[PDB]
Write a protein that binds this ligand. Sequence first.
Ligand SMILES: C[C@H]1O[C@H](O[C@H]2[C@H](O)[C@@H](O)[C@@H](O[C@@H]3C(CO)=C[C@H](N[C@H]4[C@H](O)[C@@H](O)[C@@H](O[C@H]5[C@H](O)[C@@H](O)[C@@H](O)O[C@@H]5CO)O[C@@H]4C)[C@H](O)[C@H]3O)O[C@@H]2CO)[C@H](O)[C@@H](O)[C@@H]1N
Ligand SMILES: [Ca+2]
Ligand SMILES: [Cl-]
Length: 496
Amino acid sequence: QYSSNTQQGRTSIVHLFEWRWVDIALECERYLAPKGFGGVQVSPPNENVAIHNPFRPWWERYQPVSYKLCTRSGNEDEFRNMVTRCNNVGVRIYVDAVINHMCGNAVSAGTSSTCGSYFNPGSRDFPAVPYSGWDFNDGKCKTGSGDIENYNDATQVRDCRLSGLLDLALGKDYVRSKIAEYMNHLIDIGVAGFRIDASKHMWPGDIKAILDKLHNLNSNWFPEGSKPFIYQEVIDLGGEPIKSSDYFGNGRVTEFKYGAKLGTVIRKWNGEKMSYLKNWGEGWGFMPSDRALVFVDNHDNQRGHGAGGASILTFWDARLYKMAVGFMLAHPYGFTRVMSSYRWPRYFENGKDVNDWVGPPNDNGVTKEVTINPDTTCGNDWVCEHRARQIRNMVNFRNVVDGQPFTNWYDNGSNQVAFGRGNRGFIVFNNDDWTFSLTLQTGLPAGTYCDVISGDKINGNCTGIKIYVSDDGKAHFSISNSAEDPFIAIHAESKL
Ligand SMILES: C[C@H]1O[C@H](O[C@H]2[C@H](O)[C@@H](O)[C@@H](O[C@@H]3C(CO)=C[C@H](N[C@H]4[C@H](O)[C@@H](O)[C@@H](O[C@H]5[C@H](O)[C@@H](O)[C@@H](O)O[C@@H]5CO)O[C@@H]4C)[C@H](O)[C@H]3O)O[C@@H]2CO)[C@H](O)[C@@H](O)[C@@H]1N
Ligand SMILES: [Ca+2]
Ligand SMILES: [Cl-]
């Protein structure tokens, strides 16, 4: 469950949050395959409640009504088409699995669902599964409200309703079997693994029991005996009884400490500075590298949901965000996930974004297609971080340097730092209020390299900055503090 199952020489996943299946399929073929992306995390593909107050929020997708593959992203046919087309170009699909719960207990009964299935939350009736009152934790939960009231109590965290979401009785074989049926449908279609949503809210042993029922990966694309990649969403920032380590038996785990700390460093808040990144990774108290799923922001915390945090960097803070993503993609710690977002009308009132609920770009609830502008950016309010040259070229940097050790670290005791990855790549950052101008040991063979942050290598020349590495591995770097992108990266495949 720890192996990504990506094509050899591909090392990242991109979250195409709320994208439609037909758009992901095209993106696999036209962009992700040729640019060396490993795979795509997709939004939950199962049927959810259609929530009309507020208007079609992104979070309606975290309120299941059934396991039919029928959502605003598309139907089962389009989902199958996408997984096939992506695998056929060597790009994997990872599904956001919403398995802890069904919908909110106060949602009105009827057919307000993305495939029109009937459901009745008040009577615990979900006949399109089917589930009944016997399949939820109402009798098991010991809180007065029936909801989770206290994260200091590990038992209620697992057995009670997260924010009122109907909590499935994952201790029962019947329920485990219905979930496994859903996951095996996805595996057989060709999915390479799963983000297990709300993992903290399930017993590690119930997750195990479900995983035990799963098929091996589809034997047309994956070697015989291949198991789905599992990464579990557990928010563990310390101070609670439940630990990220409790879930290592099942797969990798999201390391939320990573983006919180990195955002603080890059913002130069709380006395932090880039020179302190010398021991980044387990040195900062993070989980083992071979279990961490890392990221700068995710779909929750980029809009203040989840653990939130003021330090989180997002596309809204573009200059600092690209730097943070660049550092993440250069550094060997963890398995890297890149966020790809849409714009929404952020509006702060009393410190909170009152529009943190807004769903994807839409026409009366119908998700907009991803349009491609002439300069390869996206239209229709999709941000497409993964198409920014500075981020896309760093995704390739990570591929090029895969397996190479962290070496040749330099820092100025403040915010000018640099490091290499064996003899295959080198990166330099200036986050101080003055120019970074210095000759550094790069560890690279002698030659002329294209900086892949400012430009690209094409037909024997560079479109941006060129770096000249001499016979002894040394090169001069000059980065103004007023640079729009104050970092430079060179690698084996950017050499002229
Ligand atoms: C009925 C209910 O509906 C709406 O809730 C929505 C949330 O507002 C959205 O954020 C979203 O939730 C997703 C989800 C549920 O499927 C789980 C994910 N993330 C969770 C995480 O798993 C939880 O553990 C919890 O995090 C807490 C930490 O565990 C604590 O240590 C501490 O930090 O506090 C946090 C925050 O409480 O919440 C996270 C968001 C997943 O990634 C989410 O996207 O979708 C739900 C369902 O629609 C309404 O907003 C709410 O008002 C209603 N009561
Ligand atoms: Ca639970
Ligand atoms: Cl996540």
